[PDB]
């Protein structure tokens, strides 16, 4: 048939997922005034995708970068932690990935549907989050690994450190999943980390 | 360990930061 | 890849779950085992959401009964369930 194949479509479509799911989260759970947000259309359902230049181009550097650790199945989750005014972590979307096209490809695009579908509704699953909000990304490697970090510095303005605990460790955190998807090609689940008490 | 673990240097315009409307 | 008593697709599970829910009684301690077994499989193969939804199933039926039997299998349930989560993700299964 075809010999024209990517290769790196996989993670491709996972970094494209992981935009969309940023934008929407910090959507739904009012991160960011729905004004600066625009209905539209992913995976066939509705989203809400920021309009706005600087956030844009923070969420893009920061998929850019993780991209190449992507391709190498190198990335054990990927968390969009969002902090309140002190900034501590309040909530922690994560992605927990697993990696073992055509038709096939479209496959996985009805699979991440259904996250994007979960993500949407979540208000219902959480409490409400604090006034004063913000967010940070986490990518926790498969190993620690100094490949890893040369990898991911990819963007001279957008440089990576090693977390601290301050950046991850939530209090008595309870965990509510939204979505676990199984195939080949691709295993991923969805789950939010929710301070018991905010 | 956290040793795995990475993030950004930089943090996002914040919430209040975003009120300034420059679209 | 887990299974109950030889069920893995999730409306299998279930159905099991409420054949023997509401018609046995006197549960016997070998299956409320099986039970928290398979929720801890589900846990080692990281399928959160099965778990998540089974847990809430049981609570359901093992709640709504007055037959305090099936409220105690419960609680044992959950009870060994947290206690894992909490070694492997940390965390503890929001149920309300």
Redesign the interface.
Known sequence: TQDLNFGQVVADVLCEFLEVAVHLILYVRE???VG?FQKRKKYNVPVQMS?????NQ??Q??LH?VKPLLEKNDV?KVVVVILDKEHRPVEKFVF?I?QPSDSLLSHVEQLLRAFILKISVCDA?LDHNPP?????????????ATR??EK?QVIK?????????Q??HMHD????????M?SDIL?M?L?V??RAHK | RTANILKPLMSPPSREEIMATLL | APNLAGAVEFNDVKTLLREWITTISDPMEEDILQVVKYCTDLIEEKDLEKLDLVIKYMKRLMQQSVESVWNMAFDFILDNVQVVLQQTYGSTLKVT
């Open positions: 991160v960011y005034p600066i309009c706005h230049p600087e956030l923070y969420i550097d920061t970068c054990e927990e697993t699953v004063g909000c913000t967010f940070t990304v986490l990518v926790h490697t498969r190993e620690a890893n970090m991911i303005d957008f440089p990576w450190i090693l977390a601290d605990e950046d991850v955190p309870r965990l509510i999943p939204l979505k676990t199984t295993k689940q789950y980390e929710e």
